[PDB]
Symmetry: D2
Subunit: 338 residues, 4 copies
């Protein structure tokens, strides 16, 4: 089992990433917001005595200079780590990062943006390809009771019984996208409510795990790697999560896949060594390791954490850190003095 | 001076309006959200022993069946009120309402929606016409120091000195509209931040009055009647507010004014008995009465109040009620049992 | 049914009483703390259009110049009230007050002090004599399941099942008094915890009604009139409360009853028209009216409300107001400007 | 400079100590409450890779089996630490502990109890003898403006100007002890307020450093080692603290010093190598090292942190951790699952 110290240091990782990204809040520059976050997250991780590999991040080493897929992070990745690192610290771990989950939200001062990461031992986090993903997220009472393969209407009926709430008081977060017109209409027809977001379905899935938030499920199609980070959260909190890769451009209806074809995408999946493109992944398959760590820090306001607030001489952050190793859910409000 | 009891009853007015509107949260129906709110606000006001006239509301008596301009509300508007009402309760008062400020926000589960009203004695609230309005809102330290007639860049410079904050840490809420491209760019060029909202500039202006919110000013062009409600808030809290009517379709660039002309609009202003179309209105001119009451209750989450939350058997509301008569700012968290 | 307006005005009654009492916080003068509270509560009640009679208060008209038993309060107690008051406002109501519950706590800066009152229609609040009272208070899950006639050990066993908590994690508030040595020891022997208070068993009983407080029951012997105010709270919140008068000086062991005898006290009870001195009163017997109102405002910090905080130019209060008529539990945080 | 990791691990040290001590909350056993705390604090510290020496603790090695003065704590105190520890981790540091500050408060369910520690590099924390100590604590605005050598009346006058508050709204915490009759009376005579506590003057001094608490100074005579822990807090937060040893039994008036004499105590001070018994120690002299760490976790409720709350399957803690090395003040709310 990995070093317990890591579950503490990641507090500072998401804090520093959030602070740096928040420096570009409402500046209208999604690139600078991402770059500051990515830079601050990496540098803080590279001060941890850990032996880490990025398995979800900014993109392939070609497509992304920093926190690329397969990048080594932590002091103990160094060739002579045996001089600086305990056996414990030498344990290999996989890391999924999203330094600024919802860069558009941070750029235009929109709620829902977070610095987020997940950690497990090697092989313990699914290395999702850069694909879309059908997601179903729901609270702990609903775990294994709802199912991604059910209709939205059936899932709401089940969720209603699980949470002991009328169906017309269930709140489903759905991403505002042309791909979701039918889904959205269905939820309405069922009698439930639809909370539309422009970006940031990770803070959405995470809200499902907590009572107090007025969020009871996430439905629809999001980005796959972000799905894995959400799954890691749910596994740690005992909430429901399932994901299924989406590869057909006719389903997702975006400009990103305007010059993509279903078959071309299928072959890309084969190249990734994915043999079952239609597979439904349980939370325990997406985050499958012995130990799961999850950390988040608010950039703009969300339902669980406030955004970063600056003041003369400093900043104030709110963070959520979850460890299956220490069995703790830890809310952290930090005043940073500059 | 009006009955002190009114400053208490309006707690229940905005609560009931918010609850009713929240029943349509995320239902995708901006009409039902408005109608429930309007209906619940009016009925709760009609149980108050007050002699009220609506001066800002849903529209003219022709254009709006409920809470129309000039509608009488309160038990003491009845012809035989002298049998039911104290002299005190017989005092004539003017009321500005927005039962669901940001109906689109409530319909699609977006932050920033509130049930809101303002009250003063007769003649004490400007009866704004259904026009656009250039608005400048800012915290109490900035009152009378910034000015609507200044450039955004000069106003930020001044605001910087007032709040003792670097300019690059000032947050200006601006409505996302084509009319604001130049304004938005200017604020960026100045070095400050722009928080874009899709609707709801009343909760924006109100956030300016409170430290803790990360909102330091509102700039740009909004709707005039909503401006008056915001001015009433600021006058009560001692925050800055100024408004100036906008009448030229080339400036506002909307489909609502696509078949409108500058001159046609100017003549409409004359018909309203407005002789100076270019007048800058101080907060004290928009809300000019001896006594000002202001009440708000969150429908969806904002920076000051949570949205309405429903649970098995009830709902929970958060409200803000301000009285220059009792000199109180009153935050109210209510659990309603059904 | 009484005027709904009263359930709003009492917010201001407990606020004003608390503020006035808080002016003597930590001044070491339990008399001034009481007198300011009593004075401020009465004056604010005398501005309500209600027809009230004090049935629990500072003492008999001889023993207490202000808020004495049988004193008339409210504008509609006046002989010519028919000129000022609606039929509704003319309804007769009984009021129980404790303007400063725990004057010693306020005098020495101790937690647990509150301004508190309860209202019902005439005959609806038991007019307890100035006697001690065995009390059992417990949360809603425990209502009618525990019983004052059971041993503390049996009641803890039952409470354990009701709240789904180990017995060694139940917290019983008990007053630190020689009369409770055996009771206290019993609770320990049972395995549970004892939270000792020096004064103020009303805020204790009220804490039992709320999850979040770490208080799960009140046991032991307190003052009877304060018991009735607590019962009114519980009936409104659906929590458990029972009371039984204690009249035997050998049981209570105080200096107040050093020159009292069991038989002399029994005869005093007869004079009050109490025929069953050993009667166990249900919550519904102590507060038996159709409508129950309950209001509290913190003077020093408690588990539900902060104490009054003063600042340059004003004060900040926190209040709890409960109405079976509007079916609302209402937490109120007020900033008062002077 | 010491390992930054230590400023994170101490979060868990005070949490574990608090949880263990809270298991005896309201059990009436000040010994078990202390022993659980002491045991849990030591064991959690002995899992940190640090090279620590206890300089303030349970007592001398003879008088106290656990966390005694001079005890080595941390993995890097081991003779072969060079095999397990970085140079950084091998740095010598001094630690002051109070695993349960106010054991009486925890035993009887009283507010004000905390698990607390302070850390600096070797020589950086004054090794106070087991003596009483005159203390003056006050907020940052008052730092170096008030003075322990002034009368309480002069200090209040100065504090009044510093905080911009009327003197009659200043709150001085003073310990309820016969030794303080004259002090207490003086503060009243000055016009200010006295908040009496039975134990726990560390949480009192710490409250002075924060606005929001209604505590503006600590005055009077407390225990010396606890004074040093408080000084460490103030130095980190920039609040005022001064201490002066009290050695004369006629001044302190306790049973602990009933068979002590002034001269006997003076000679004890000489044996400790203290040459100036009348010395006034600045905060920077009591906590004089380059780096200061301070950690606290609530056991029973205080003004900054809630006490430990238990629930079916776990506990919830609130902690405050301050580091001059990371320049952070960090509030931590942790849900522990068992
Ligand atoms: O290609 P589109 O239509 O934008 O959808 C991808 C979106 O990217 C985010 O919103 C942000 O990275 C992310 O939170 C979601 O996973 C979402 O699906
Ligand atoms: O005509 P558009 O371009 O929509 O602008 C009017 C908008 O209406 C609201 O957003 C909502 O009623 C309101 O909060 C604002 O005043 C705003 O200006
Ligand atoms: O006669 P004692 O031994 O003091 O007991 C009476 C006490 O009075 C209060 O503590 C305060 O009025 C009150 O909250 C309680 O009812 C308590 O019993
Ligand atoms: O000898 P007494 O009269 O008890 O005074 C010592 C007290 O011990 C504590 O209250 C608790 O350890 C501690 O918080 C204080 O320092 C206090 O002075
Ligand atoms: Mg990216
Ligand atoms: Mg991403
Ligand atoms: Mg996108
Ligand atoms: Mg409308
Ligand atoms: Mg409107
Ligand atoms: Mg519009
Ligand atoms: Mg009394
Ligand atoms: Mg009393
Ligand atoms: Mg007494
Ligand atoms: Mg000890
Ligand atoms: Mg101690
Ligand atoms: Mg002692």
């Amino acid at each position: 089992s990995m070093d317990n110290v890591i579950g503490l240091e990641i507090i500072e990782v998401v804090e520093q990433a959030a602070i740096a990204s928040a420096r570009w809040m409402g500046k209208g520059d999604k690139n600078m917001a991402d770059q500051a976050a990515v830079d601050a997250m990496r540098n803080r991780m590279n001060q941890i005595h850990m032996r880490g590999r990025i398995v979800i991040g900014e993109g392939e080493r070609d497509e992304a200079p920093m926190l690329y897929i397969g990048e080594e992070v932590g002091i103990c990745t160094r060739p002579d780590a045996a001089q600086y690192c305990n056996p414990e610290e030498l344990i290999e771990i996989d890391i999924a990062v999203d330094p600024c989950e919802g860069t558009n939200l941070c750029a235009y001062g929109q709620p829902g943006s977070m610095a987020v990461l997940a950690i497990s031992e090697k092989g313990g986090l699914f290395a999702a390809p850069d694909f879309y993903m059908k997601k179903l997220a729901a609270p702990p009472a609903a775990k294994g009771k709802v199912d991604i393969r059910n209709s939205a209407t059936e899932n709401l009926k089940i969720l209603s019984e699980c949470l002991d709430r009328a169906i017309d008081e269930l709140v489903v977060v759905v991403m505002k996208r042309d791909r979701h017109n039918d889904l959205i209409q269905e939820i309405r027809d069922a009698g439930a409510r639809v909370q539309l977001i422009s970006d940031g379905d990770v803070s959405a899935a995470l809200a499902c795990a907590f009572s107090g938030t007025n969020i009871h499920a996430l439905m629809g199609i999001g980005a796959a790697p972000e799905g894995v980070i959400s799954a890691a959260a749910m596994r740690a909190l005992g909430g429901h999560f399932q994901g299924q890769l989406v590869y057909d451009p006719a389903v997702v209806m975006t400009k990103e896949w305007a010059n993509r074809t279903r078959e071309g995408n299928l072959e890309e999946l084969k190249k990734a060594g994915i043999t079952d493109p239609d597979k439904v992944y349980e939370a325990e398959e997406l985050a499958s390791g012995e130990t799961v760590l999850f950390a988040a820090c608010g950039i703009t306001p969300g339902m669980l954490m406030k955004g970063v607030r600056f003041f003369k001489g400093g900043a104030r952050t709110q963070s959520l850190v979850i460890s299956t190793q220490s069995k703790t859910a830890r809310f952290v409000d930090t005043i940073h003095m500059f």
